[PDB]
């Protein structure tokens, strides 16, 4: 049929690397994208189309209670075993992950309407700002 | 404020590559982890936290109209300007993208339940099969 609406999930994918190299796509995204399941959402009204193909890289679910340490396996990242503890520093949610790497943790606080997250490891600090949806 | 409830979407991510160098993450995972989309859903109840973070690769997101040609700019892919034209060949949605690369386009058709799409660039043909959810 001509109706292509719906949420589609990739069953198979052949010659993805060759097609991507034909487009001069670099090697790393070629290796990663071929391992991910693509989900193409298609919204069609007659001859007007809206195609959005997406891919889920990794999911990271963590459950914790403030002041109660827990055995956290940092899966979907570096996959290390750390004992994590989350505490309130005034209004900033601070988490210390005691394990192999030292000075490892994160600080997560709200400012106005934005979410500020600072991931800390040794002498490297990454800043991630989130907008509310 | 300590209320961090809600669904957040990342709009900035600086020094992710350094924080990832500290944790010894795989090379290509670092190279692709600098161009991905992150959504963090936070379910908070006083001090109990249920955090769910999803990393997401954007393969392609496009809107078009059948029979009307348009000037496409393929960011999230190879970042090239192409004159795209989408038509119906029977029940097969054919798309020709005229530009630098020759024989660039795709064919999208439905068979019973499955969605079949043949992307093609030059002499490279990529065939993808999708199942409706």
CA distance A30 to A35: 9
CA distance A51 to A101: 43
CA distance A55 to A8: 12
Distance in Å, alpha carbon of A96 to nearest chain B alpha carbon: 15
Distances, alpha carbon B53 to alpha carbons B41, B50, B124, in Å: 6, 10, 36
The CATH homologous superfamily to which domain A1-133 belongs is: Calycin beta-barrel core domain (2.40.128.20)
From B11, B51, B55, residue closest to A62, measured CB to CB: B51
Q: B28: which DSSP letter? A: H
Contact B118, A11 (CB under 8 A): no
Residue among A55, A28, A17 at smallest CA distance from B32: A28
Q: Which residues contact B69 (CB under 8 A, 6 or more apart)?
A: B83, B84, B85
Q: Which residues contact A100 (CB under 8 A, 6 or more apart)?
A: A80, A82
Q: Which residues contact B113 (CB under 8 A, 6 or more apart)?
A: B131, B132
Kindly list the residues from chain B whose CB atom is less than 8 angstroms away from the CB atom of residue A49. Answer: 63-66, 86
Token reading at A60: 């990271």
Scan residues 20-59 of A and list those with Cβ closer than 8 Å to B: 20-29, 31-33, 36, 38-40, 42, 47-59
CA distance A45 to B4: 38
Residue among A74, A78, A7 at smallest CA distance from A44: A7
- Rg for chain B, CA atoms, rounded: 20
The pairing of strands B92-98 and B105-111 is: antiparallel
CA distance A13 to A42: 18
Q: B21: which DSSP letter? A: H
Distances, alpha carbon A49 to alpha carbons A14, A19, B67, B133, in Å: 25, 24, 12, 19
Contact B44, B64 (CB under 8 A): no
From B48, B64, B131, residue closest to A8, measured CB to CB: B131
Q: Which sequence spans correspond to the domains of chain A?
A: 1-133
Q: Between chains, do A2 and B40 touch, taking CB under 8 Å as contact?
A: no
CA distance B66 to B93: 9
Q: Please calculate the CA angle A34-A27-B76 and round it to the nearest 5 degrees.
A: 70
In the block, residue with structure tokens 């004992």? A83
């Amino acid at each position: 049929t001509r109706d292509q609406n719906g949420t589609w999930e990739m069953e198979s994918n052949e010659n993805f690397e060759g097609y991507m190299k034909a487009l001069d796509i670099d090697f790393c995204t070629r290796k990663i994208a071929v391992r991910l399941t693509q989900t193409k959402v298609i919204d069609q009204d007659g001859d007007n189309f809206k195609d959005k193909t997406t891919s889920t890289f990794r999911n990271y679910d963590v459950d914790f209670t403030v002041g109660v340490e827990f055995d956290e396996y940092t899966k979907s990242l570096d996959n290390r075993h750390v004992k994590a503890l989350v505490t309130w520093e005034g209004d900033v949610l601070v988490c210390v992950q005691k394990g192999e790497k030292e000075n490892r943790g994160w600080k997560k606080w709200i400012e106005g309407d934005k979410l500020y997250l600072e991931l800390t490891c040794g002498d490297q600090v990454c800043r991630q700002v989130f907008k509310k949806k």
